[PDB]
UniProtKB/Swiss-Prot annotation:
This is Protease 2A. It comes from Coxsackievirus A16 (strain G-10). The active site is at H15 (for protease 2a activity), D33 (for protease 2a activity), C104 (for protease 2a activity). It comes from the Viruses. It catalyses: Selective cleavage of Tyr-|-Gly bond in the picornavirus polyprotein. Zn(2+) 1 binds at C50, C52, C110, H112. Homodimer. Cysteine protease that cleaves viral polyprotein and specific host proteins. It is responsible for the autocatalytic cleavage between the P1 and P2 regions, which is the first cleavage occurring in the polyprotein. Also cleaves the host translation initiation factor EIF4G1, in order to shut down the capped cellular mRNA translation. Inhibits the host nucleus-cytoplasm protein and RNA trafficking by cleaving host members of the nuclear pores. Counteracts stress granule formation probably by antagonizing its assembly or promoting its dissassembly.
Length: 139
């Protein structure tokens, strides 16, 4: 669990979206595992607008933050699950680090702000869904 709260938006993993998120849907992309819904109260998270490949992520399965080097956003094969058949997820960034299924939603940050949220993992690797390109989150 976990979300990005910026302005009047709530950014979450699409496979963990609630009924309220679908009733207040702004945008969703299955290929990116992202869903953005609207909120009545303001959000104060700052989105990083950058090309950083180092940062820190929150890992709820360990209750610890971890520094990571991560790849550039791209198309990576993600194995079939109860939410998706086997497919390439786009805008995904990989790093060496611990993750477990309940870790989706943990924020990845750099000095510039929020980079994305935990989306995939397995075998000593953790995958992050990038949000830096979603310029409309600020506007
Ligand atoms: C941090 S998730 C994780 C971590 C360690 C081991 C296994 C996982 C599960 C995992 O990767 N997914 C299952 C749910 C759907 C998924 O989020 C997607 N975007 O397709 C992928
Ligand atoms: Zn940055």
């Amino acid at each position: 669990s976990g979300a990005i709260y910026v302005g009047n938006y709530r950014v979450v993993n699409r496979h963990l979206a609630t009924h309220n998120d679908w009733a207040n849907l702004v945008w969703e992309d299955s290929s990116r595992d992202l869903l953005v819904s609207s909120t009545t109260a303001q959000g104060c998270d700052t989105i990083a607008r950058c090309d950083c490949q180092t940062g820190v992520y929150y890992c709820s399965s360990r209750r610890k933050h971890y520094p990571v080097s991560f790849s550039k956003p791209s198309l990576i094969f993600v194995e079939a699950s109860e939410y998706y058949p086997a497919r390439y997820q786009s805008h995904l960034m990989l790093a060496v680090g611990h993750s477990e299924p309940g870790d989706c939603g943990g924020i990845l940050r750099c000095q510039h702000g929020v980079v994305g949220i935990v989306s995939t993992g397995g075998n000593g690797l953790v995958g992050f869904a990038d949000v830096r390109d979603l310029l409309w989150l600020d506007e």
